[PDB]
Design a binder for this molecule. Structure first.
Ligand code: C30
Ligand code: CL
Length: 253
């Protein structure tokens, strides 16, 4: 439990936030704790009235303004100013409140998956199986079809990446995240999960999160921007404005 420097509720909210009755957002950050850059960056917005969730993967190389540091790769916000600055960067990029944030290292992820007795993933790509084999020196060998993956297998699945674009990797992360929720429908954190709300409050949201009528994914499209060999992902501004309106409406702001 670690409070954000911004205060009791997001500065983006014009009205008083009621966590038990309002739609809300959660930012999930995956870190390699070998500050560190954020390699997994998933924002989930929950529509309380409609009992729906929308997942969004923020491209790690998205070309965005990092407050106090200028335009740069989104992933660097966590390196320059930790969770506080990542939250500020998201709130500026999408013009929405980030109500809750959860920061995880490899160990917390593996322990969560294993405590759930694995998570179900339908593997479909020989190329993905092959690249994971390469990543792990053959320690992780996935099979096509629907199988229950343990923590090590799931972790390798959400880490693998062919080249610059983390498009497919973000989709694998949202896939596994939703599988974790599915498996939970039926203490462990330790010092490896950091979140800006109490364990008690986190549990109070569990019934709502695990009884959603629908889960959907949305995308920030764009194109490669390589001004001097340094790779950025420039966001399509029309799609960005579309996503912003969609999440603003979901959050009732
Ligand atoms: C393996 C690889 O290929 N690496 C590439 C490169 O480095 P990289 O791209 O940074 O990857 P990496 O450093 O190894 O691992 C770091 C990568 C990632 C994606 C970080 C993963 C970290 C995690 C903690 C797991 C992923 C996060 C997910 C699925 C979302 C959040 C998950 C959480 C919070 C865990 C439990 C979930 C909970 C509590 C959800 C409940 C709450 C709600 C639903 C509101 O290195 C070479 C050149 O340098 C390249 O050639 C090479 O391709
Ligand atoms: Cl696959």
């Amino acid at each position: 439990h670690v409070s954000l420097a911004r205060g009791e509720q997001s500065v983006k909210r014009i009205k008083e936030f009621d966590p038990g009755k309002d739609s809300f957002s959660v930012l999930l950050l995956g870190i390699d704790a070998r500050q560190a850059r954020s390699d997994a960056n998933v924002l989930v917005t929950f529509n309380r009235k409609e009992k729906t969730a929308k997942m969004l993967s923020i491209p790690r190389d998205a070309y965005v303004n990092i407050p106090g540091h200028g335009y740069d790769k989104f992933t660097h916000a966590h390196a320059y100013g930790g969770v506080d600055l990542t939250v500020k960067t998201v709130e500026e990029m999408l013009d929405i409140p980030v109500d809750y944030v959860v920061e995880s290292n490899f160990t917390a992820f593996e322990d969560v998956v294993n405590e759930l007795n694995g998570v179900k993933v339908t593997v479909k790509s020989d190329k993905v199986i092959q690249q994971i084999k390469k990543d792990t020196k053959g320690k992780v060998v996935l099979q096509k079809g629907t199988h229950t993956l343990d923590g090590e297998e799931a972790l390798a699945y959400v880490r693998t990446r062919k080249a610059d674009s983390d498009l497919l990797r973000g989709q694998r992360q949202m896939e596994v995240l939703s599988a974790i929720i599915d498996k939970s429908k039926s203490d462990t954190m330790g010092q490896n999960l950091k979140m800006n709300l109490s364990l008690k409050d986190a549990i109070g949201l569990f019934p709502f999160i695990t009884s959603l009528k629908s889960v959907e994914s949305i995308q920030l499209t764009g194109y490669d921007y390589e001004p001097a060999g340094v790779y950025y992902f420039k966001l399509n501004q029309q799609k960005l404005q579309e996503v912003k309106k969609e999440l603003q409406n979901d959050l009732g702001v």
